[PDB]
């Protein structure tokens, strides 16, 4: 009755960050050690809780958010951050209690690519918001009637993932673990 | 810049009794999403790095004996040591980690309380070997006393000295919980040989009246 | 569990530059944020700042924001604390600590790095006897270790054999910029005619070793 | 149609503050990236700052902590506040519409920001008289600061054959300039030639008439 | 920071020819390049985006090519107004950076300068300073030698030169050399002459006046 963290991290394919995937984890025993002393990861940033008590704390729900971004943007997956990814694709709340785990995925997601990110939005996203609109972005007062043109752009943009790129441009796979505690019985706990 | 003030600054508890240390926060450190206060208690024994005792204001760290307990919320927190032991003598700090920048309390010193013990007073004139150098050092020793508070006054020909003495105190002895103190009076060799009587006067709680230990310069048996 | 180790003791003159190290070892240094703690002699702990070695994110205390610098090298799992021009103010012990994330307590602590910044230069101590008074049941004798720099010195009695009743006082900083110390011992006065009491003073910075015999005056 | 028109360039002392404005037309400024890009005199282009469509702001290292980019949606205007200007910040600042923090598809005319402790001085205008085919005449605009100087001939009616030279910085610390014209030598007694010189930093307007001596 | 290097720094071609400008990148930027044109006294105009797509309103004679670290801009069938400074800009990583530019002047037949000399105004002369002006009008190429000789004595260090940018229909240059003097020094000599050496003149042209 372990929780299926492997299906998330060891997933064959990952989603684009504008359409980030979320897996809800509940009614299970979570052994975080099979996940956390792998040194495979490049960044392991936690906010408000330490993994060294995770195997031995309890939460109502756990959320695993999966996507792919660039190196320059992994720093934006954090509370109180600003930038294209943090403002238009995936936003963490300032009171975020969780972990952001990112690792280089040049071998798997870089070809001599299919991932996209939102480039245009009139207002920043609220925390844990997911925008999968493909509606033409209206940069002027004239409506666009659904075709690209002057003052009307496609809101999404393709990543240029090539293996020869610098480390900053390489694709990184990112998993965000959020720990949900409310006024309800806890359903995810550690071996303890 | 959340401020934390702990009280009291000093604490004297007897072996097996209770030690209570309060820590008051300027602003609340309760993380309402996780419903846990982001407050910690650390212990620092003399000459050693701080050790984490309690986190989340009440959760003891692994290996910490059961006599340590944490309590409080909002702005008021307390660290409680029940049945104080001689190895618990240290300075205890409350630290907030709700927001950066992290902040510490001023510190709480914990010593063992025991029955009053009067000091034994000894006086040492300057060696002849040191006098050839040009400076004289007279030493007064207060051995094995409690409590720590003691008054030592230097008198040269019954004239009270000021500004030329330095004091040094040991840490609490780990077997009899006493202190010892050294008062060094440093003088020129000329001023040393312009007077005859050198006395060290000690006032302490364990003495009925002040104890004076004196010698005469150049006197022998 | 994870383990921190810091660099050795530093003694510098005012105006010099300094960089102290803290290296981390263990299971999962990957998620550990490293903080710096200042403790001036006799004072409490002051939080200086924090860094994440994985990407170099750094936060500073407003009190320390502009005149220290906190760096990290992830390849050797090391954090660094650096001054460009030291003052005498900066004399303290500096602790590197580690917690498993932001807004987490500091589980892991280093042993500390002692930094002494002084205009003085290295000088060996001079050792004088505190002879037993001319009354011989209990007697007190000792050694005065004066005018040395920098810390520390080690004092033993009878080449380490005498320990009970020995009180070696903490060093005091004189206005001269040098340190002084005294070590005393209480012994029976039966002994005084029979047994010879030698104190051994070692000052490694100046390579000074002095053995001094303490006897009553003649 | 897109229009970007700038405002607020001028002379300012070191350590002083200035606010540049860029009025925009033809797109809604609140849903577009916009940027300020400066160009030092005789140098290349340097990106200074950007405002995102969502309100996020970013600056270059040379101007962070001193420059603030802003926008007024009720005036359709972009603002750049500078606060602590240095002489190295002297440049022509360009307002630019930015396509997603990528490239600048529309630019404003630019406004010149001069950071100097020198005082404003108005120019003196002198005639360069024609000689005793084709003849040449002109006006010499000397000893002014700062730039720019705008010269016409016959209030804009004469544009053919005119050459207004770039200003040269004398060792005085002031600027001087000449504007000349080529006309038929038939014309000198008949036609009247007047140069209109305008130095707005000094509020100087001189209509100087030149004729043979 | 990523540096962009343009080559050549300046290029001179006749109308109807092809211009090829190269921009090379410190690190690879993968078709994230743009080309701008800036005429004198004007703002940059977007020419090319995405290293290969042409901006709206740009004629077909402008073309972009390249990727990785090597990019090329080609302007075919040059027109006397296609002459300006051309900038490459990268938007691979932050911060975005520009190259110094490639200045492109137009090649034309050699044109001799017409030389005029202007004595100092009486109005300025009352002020204490004389300014002597020599003008070289409508010449090509840009390289010209101007020498001030006062009573056939060569003067040095008291003259300043200014050159216009290329006239945009007949592609000539013009130059002003101003000799500045005190009125005392000005009234200490009689003949003021301006001697011009240029490729379009068989021998130097001297224009002089007497005080
Ligand atoms: C994920 O894959 C790695 C590499 O093969 C493996 O070591 C790890 O055990 C896997 N995790 C799970 C939960 O199966």
Resolution value (Å, 1 decimal): 2.9
Is the distance from the beta carbon of residue A5 to the nearest atom of ligand 1 less than 6 Å? yes
CATH of the domain at D199: 2.60.40.10
For residues C96 and C141, membership in a common domain is answered with no
Distance of CA A138 to the CA centre of its chain: 27
Distance CA A16, CA D163 (A): 59
| End-of-domain residue from the set C117, C142, C164 | C117
By residue count, chain C amounts to 218
Measured from the Cα of A6, ligand 1's closest atom is 13
The CATH class, in words, for B120-216 is mainly beta
Of C92, C86, C94, C90, give the one whose Cα is nearest residue C37: C94
Q: Map out the domains of chain B as residue ranges.
A: 4-112, 120-216
| A46 contacts on C by Cβ (under 8 Å) | 31, 100-102, 104
Of E102, E77, E85, give the one whose Cα is nearest residue E14: E77
Q: Which two tokens stand for residue E30?
A: 């993968």
For residues D15 and D111, membership in a common domain is answered with yes
Is the distance from the beta carbon of residue A127 to the nearest atom of ligand 1 less than 6 Å? no
How is E10-62 classified by DSSP, letter by letter?
Answer: EEEE-TTS-EEEEEEESS--TT-EEEEEE-TTS--EEEEETTTEEPTT--TTE
B90: which residues sit within 8 A by CB, 6+ positions away? B43, B44, B45, B46, B110
Chain D residues with CB within 8 Å of chain A CB: 26-28, 30-32, 52-56, 99-101
Q: How far is C14 from chain B (nearest CA, A)?
A: 26
Distance CA B187, CA B150 (A): 23
| Domain extent for C35 | 2-117
| C107 contacts on A by Cβ (under 8 Å) | 50, 52
E29: which residues sit within 8 A by CB, 6+ positions away? E2, E68, E69, E90, E91, E92, E93
CB-based contact B70:B41 (threshold 8 Å): yes
Distance CA A38, CA A159 (A): 28
| A164 contacts on E by Cβ (under 8 Å) | 28, 68
| Record: contact A52-C52, CB cut-off 8 A | no
For residues D93 and D163, membership in a common domain is answered with no
A47: which residues sit within 8 A by CB, 6+ positions away? A78, A79, A96, A97, A98, A99, A100, C101, C102, C103
Residue of chain B with shortest Cα separation from A98: B34
- % helix, strand, coil for chain A, step of 5: 15, 30, 55
Is the distance from the beta carbon of residue A36 to the nearest atom of ligand 1 less than 6 Å? no
Q: Which CATH architecture has domain B4-112?
A: Sandwich (2.60)
Taking the Cβ of residue A166 and every Cβ of chain E, the question of whether any pair is shorter than 8 Å is answered with yes
Distance CA C122, CA D104 (A): 64
Q: How far is A158 from chain D (nearest CA, A)?
A: 13
For residues D34 and D109, membership in a common domain is answered with yes
Q: Are β-strands B135-145 and B179-188 bridged in parallel, bridged antiparallel, or unpaired? A: antiparallel
CB-based contact C51:C71 (threshold 8 Å): yes
How is A132-185 classified by DSSP, letter by letter?
Answer: ---PPEE-SSS--TTS-BTTEE-SEEE----TTS-TTTSEEEEEEEEEE--SS-
Taking the Cβ of residue A166 and every Cβ of chain B, the question of whether any pair is shorter than 8 Å is answered with no
Residue among A38, A64, A66, A175 to mutate when testing ligand 1 (max atoms within 8 A of CB): A38
Task: Give the Å distances, CA to CA, from C99 to A190, B203, B211, C35.
Answer: 20, 48, 53, 8
Distance CA B168, CA D166 (A): 80
Residues 97-136, chain A: which have Cβ within 8 Å of D?
119-124
Chain D interface, best mutation among E45, E121, E159, E177, by max D CB count within 10 A: E121
CB-based contact E159:E169 (threshold 8 Å): no
How is D26-90 classified by DSSP, letter by letter?
Answer: SS-GGGSEEEEEEE-TTS-EEEEEEE-TTS-EEE-TTTTTT-EEEEETTTTEEEEE-SS--GGG-
For residues D43 and D111, membership in a common domain is answered with yes
Residue for token pair 């206060």: B37
CB-based contact D92:D35 (threshold 8 Å): no
Please tell me the distance between residue C8's alpha carbon and the centre of ligand 1 in angstroms.
Answer: 41
The domains spanning E4-106 and E114-210 adopt the same CATH topology: yes
Chain B interface, best mutation among A45, A48, A186, by max B CB count within 10 A: A48
| Record: contact D56-A151, CB cut-off 8 A | no
Q: How far is A173 from chain D (nearest CA, A)?
A: 24
For residues D64 and D47, membership in a common domain is answered with yes
CB-based contact B67:B7 (threshold 8 Å): no
Cis? peptide before B96, omega within 30° of 0: no
Q: How far is A43 from chain E (nearest CA, A)?
A: 20
Residue among A34, A103, A105 to mutate when testing ligand 1 (max atoms within 8 A of CB): A34
CB-based contact B154:B191 (threshold 8 Å): no
Nearest CA to ligand 1 atom 13: A6
| Record: contact D168-E87, CB cut-off 8 A | no
Q: Which residues of C177-186 are buried (b: 16+ CB within 10 A; e: fewer)?
A: ebbbbbbbbb
Three-class SS string for C124-186?
CCEEEEECCCCCCCEEEEEEEEEEEECCCCEEEECCCCECCCEEECCCEECCCCCEEEEEEEE
**What's the number of domains chain C is made of?**
2
Q: Which two tokens stand for residue E33?
A: 């390049």
CB-based contact D179:D149 (threshold 8 Å): no
For residues C103 and C135, membership in a common domain is answered with no
Of C165, C156, C129, give the one whose Cα is nearest residue C144: C129
Closest in A72, A160, A166 to E27, CB measured: A166
What is chain B's alpha carbon radius of gyration, rounded to the nearest angstrom? 24
Q: How far is E140 from chain A (nearest CA, A)?
A: 43
Measured from the Cα of A10, ligand 1's closest atom is 1
Is the distance from the beta carbon of residue A6 to the nearest atom of ligand 1 less than 6 Å? yes
Taking the Cβ of residue B190 and every Cβ of chain A, the question of whether any pair is shorter than 8 Å is answered with no
Taking the Cβ of residue B74 and every Cβ of chain C, the question of whether any pair is shorter than 8 Å is answered with no
The CATH class, in words, for E4-106 is mainly beta
Residues 24-43, chain A: which have Cβ within 8 Å of C?
36-37, 39, 41-43
| End-of-domain residue from the set C85, C117, C149 | C117
For residues C185 and C151, membership in a common domain is answered with yes
| Record: contact C95-B50, CB cut-off 8 A | yes
**CATH, domain E114-210, list 1.20.1420.30, 1.10.10.10, 2.60.40.10, 1.10.3470.10:** 2.60.40.10
Taking the Cβ of residue A162 and every Cβ of chain E, the question of whether any pair is shorter than 8 Å is answered with yes
Distance CA A85, CA A92 (A): 11
| E30 contacts on A by Cβ (under 8 Å) | 160, 162, 165, 169
Q: Which two tokens stand for residue B4?
A: 């934390």
| E93 contacts on A by Cβ (under 8 Å) | 72, 166, 168-169
C near A: at least 3 beta-carbon pairs less than 8 Å apart: yes
Please tell me the distance between residue A25's alpha carbon and the centre of ligand 1 in angstroms.
Answer: 18
Is the distance from the beta carbon of residue A10 to the nearest atom of ligand 1 less than 6 Å? yes
Q: Is the dihedral of CA C186, C188, C190, C191 positive or negative?
A: negative
Task: Give the Å distances, CA to CA, from C10 to B7, C112, C113, C121.
Answer: 35, 11, 8, 13
Residues 89-108, chain B: which have Cβ within 8 Å of C?
91, 93, 95, 97-107
Residues paired with residue A44 on neighbouring β-strands, in sequence order: A101
Nearest CA to ligand 1 atom 10: A6
Please tell me the distance between residue A31's alpha carbon and the centre of ligand 1 in angstroms.
Answer: 13
For residues C91 and C155, membership in a common domain is answered with no
| End-of-domain residue from the set C95, C117, C139 | C117
Distance CA C204, CA B99 (A): 44
Distance CA E119, CA E187 (A): 12
Residue among A6, A11, A101 to mutate when testing ligand 1 (max atoms within 8 A of CB): A6
D near A: at least 3 beta-carbon pairs less than 8 Å apart: yes
The H or E element that residue A7 is part of is helix A6-9
For residues D128 and D67, membership in a common domain is answered with no
Measured from the Cα of A5, ligand 1's closest atom is 13
For residues D130 and D150, membership in a common domain is answered with yes
| Record: contact A165-E56, CB cut-off 8 A | no
Task: Give the Å distances, CA to CA, from D173 to B179, C152, D63, D159.
Answer: 77, 64, 27, 30
C near D: at least 3 beta-carbon pairs less than 8 Å apart: no
| Record: contact A122-D27, CB cut-off 8 A | no
Of D31, D8, D33, give the one whose Cα is nearest residue D21: D8
């Amino acid at each position: 009755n372990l929780c299926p963290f492997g299906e998330v991290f060891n997933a064959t394919r990952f989603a684009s960050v504008y359409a980030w995937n979320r897996k809800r984890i509940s009614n299970c025993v979570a052994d975080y050690s099979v996940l956390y002393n792998s040194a495979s990861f490049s960044t392991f940033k936690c906010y408000g809780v330490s993994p060294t008590k995770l195997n031995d704390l309890c939460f109502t729900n756990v959320y695993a958010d999966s996507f792919v971004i660039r190196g320059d943007e992994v720093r934006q997956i954090a509370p109180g951050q600003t930038g294209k990814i943090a403002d238009y694709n995936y936003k963490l709340p300032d009171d975020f209690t969780g972990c952001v785990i990112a690792w280089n995925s040049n071998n798997l997601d870089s070809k001599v690519y299919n991932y996209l990110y939102r480039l245009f939005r009139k207002s920043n996203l609220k925390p844990f918001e997911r925008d999968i609109s493909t509606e033409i972005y209206q940069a002027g007062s004239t409506p666009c009637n659904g075709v690209e043109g002057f003052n009307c752009y496609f809101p999404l943009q393709s990543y240029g993932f090539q293996p020869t790129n610098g480390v900053g441009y390489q694709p990184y796979r990112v998993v965000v673990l959020s720990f949900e505690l409310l006024h309800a019985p806890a359903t995810v706990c550690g071996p303890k | 810049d959340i401020q934390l003030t702990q009280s009291p600054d000093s604490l004297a508890v007897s072996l097996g009794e209770r030690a209570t240390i309060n820590c008051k926060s300027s602003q609340s450190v309760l993380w309402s999403s996780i419903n846990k206060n982001y407050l910690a208690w650390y212990q620092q024994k003399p000459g050693q790095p701080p050790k984490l005792l309690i986190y989340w204001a009440s959760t003891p760290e692994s290996g910490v004996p059961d006599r340590f307990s944490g309590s409080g919320s909002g702005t008021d927190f307390t660290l409680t040591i029940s049945s104080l032991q001689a190895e618990d003598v240290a300075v205890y700090y409350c630290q907030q980690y709700y927001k950066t920048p992290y902040t510490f309390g001023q510190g709480t010193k914990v010593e063992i309380k025991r029955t009053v013990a009067a000091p034994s007073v000894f006086i040492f004139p300057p060696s002849d070997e040191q006098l050839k150098s040009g400076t004289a050092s007279v030493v007064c020793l207060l051995n094995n006393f409690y409590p720590r508070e003691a008054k030592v006054q230097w008198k040269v020909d019954n004239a009270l000295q000021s500004g030329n003495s330095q004091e040094s105190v040991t840490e609490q002895d780990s077997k009899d919980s006493t202190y010892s103190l050294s008062s060094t009076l440093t003088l020129s060799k000329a001023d040393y040989e312009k007077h005859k009587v050198y006395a060290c006067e000690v006032t302490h709680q364990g003495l009925s009246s002040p104890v004076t230990k004196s010698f005469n310069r150049g006197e022998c048996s | 569990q994870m383990q921190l180790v810091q660099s050795g003791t530093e003694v510098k003159k005012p105006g010099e530059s300094l960089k102290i190290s803290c290296k981390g070892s263990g299971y999962g240094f990957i998620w550990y944020w490293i903080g710096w703690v200042r403790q001036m002699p006799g004072k409490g702990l002051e939080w200086m700042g924090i860094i994440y070695p994985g990407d170099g994110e750094t936060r500073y205390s407003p009190s320390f924001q502009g005149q220290v610098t906190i760096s990290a090298d992830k390849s050797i799992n090391t954090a660094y604390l650096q001054w460009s021009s030291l003052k005498a103010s900066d004399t303290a012990i500096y602790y590197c600590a580690g917690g498993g994330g932001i807004s987490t307590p500091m589980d892991v602590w280093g042993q500390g790095t002692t930094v002494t910044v002084s205009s003085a230069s290295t000088k060996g101590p001079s050792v004088f006897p505190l002879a037993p008074s001319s009354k011989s049941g209990t007697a007190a004798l000792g050694c005065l270790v004066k005018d040395y720099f920098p810390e520390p010195v080690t004092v033993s009695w009878n080449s380490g054999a005498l320990t009970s009743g020995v009180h070696t006082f903490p060093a005091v900083l004189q206005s001269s910029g040098l340190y002084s110390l005294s070590s005393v011992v209480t012994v029976p006065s039966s002994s005084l005619g029979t047994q010879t009491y030698i104190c051994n003073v070692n000052h490694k910075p100046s390579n000074t070793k002095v053995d001094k015999k303490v006897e009553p005056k003649s």
